[PDB]
Design a protein around this ligand. Structure first.
Ligand SMILES: [Ca+2]
Length: 223
């Protein structure tokens, strides 16, 4: 997160870190056994880390649970990032509490202008590189579809939305991939892609979760 603020420990209780020897992506806990992330975060050997603040220090609220199954969206295209969503099942159910809690799925899509909370452990610099230990947060509005498409000619599908600031300076970045965009207490986006980070006229692009609720629910119901 570039231009954000320190969330505060366990104030984003649905935020997970995906770990394969190191943090490599975010995700969102959606029930005691399932995490939603980006398809571009797919790899083998995932341990889901819940209850994290400092990802380098055991602080006492963590739960570390290995993934038993990953399901990349059937229509994910890794060249265009269309359908950039994946589900991860935990080998055992997380113990839910005030600091480890699921985020509700949307019942409706969110509109341009809605304020959302984007969070992660990604790079905090737009030029140069600095990776934080503690979770970073950014409040950002959903941008209109027309401004999103104008920012990224030929690249924005109906499964994507932009959020952020066209003036630059505030954005998600490398390592925030797969993490949550939460608006009015619902998971509306997944950190997907952008051109650089926090660049003028190049806001972050996010997977439009509301399009996937039926797939998520039916997948969970049979897996
Ligand atoms: Ca920790």
């Amino acid at each position: 997160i570039v231009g954000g603020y320190t969330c505060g420990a366990n104030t984003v209780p649905y935020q997970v870190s995906l770990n394969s020897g190191y943090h490599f992506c975010g995700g969102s806990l959606i029930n005691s056994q399932w995490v939603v992330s980006a398809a571009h975060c797919y790899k083998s050997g995932i341990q889901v880390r819940l209850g994290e603040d400092n990802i380098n220090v055991v602080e006492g609220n963590e739960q570390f649970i290995s993934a038993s199954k990953s399901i990349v969206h059937p229509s994910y295209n890794s060249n265009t990032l269309n359908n950039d969503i994946m589900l991860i099942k935990l080998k055992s159910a997380a113990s839910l509490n005030s600091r480890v809690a699921s985020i509700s799925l949307p019942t409706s899509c969110a509109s341009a202008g809605t304020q959302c909370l984007i969070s992660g452990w990604g790079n905090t610099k737009s030029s140069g590189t600095s990776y934080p230990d503690v979770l970073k947060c950014l409040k950002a509005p959903i941008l209109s579809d027309s401004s999103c498409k104008s920012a990224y000619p030929g690249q924005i599908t109906s499964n994507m939305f932009c959020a952020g600031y066209l003036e630059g300076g505030k954005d998600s970045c490398q390592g925030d991939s797969g993490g949550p965009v939460v608006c009015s207490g619902k998971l509306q986006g997944i950190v997907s892609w952008g051109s650089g980070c926090a660049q003028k006229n190049k806001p972050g692009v996010y997977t439009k979760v509301c399009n996937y609720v039926s797939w998520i629910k039916q997948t969970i119901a049979s897996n």
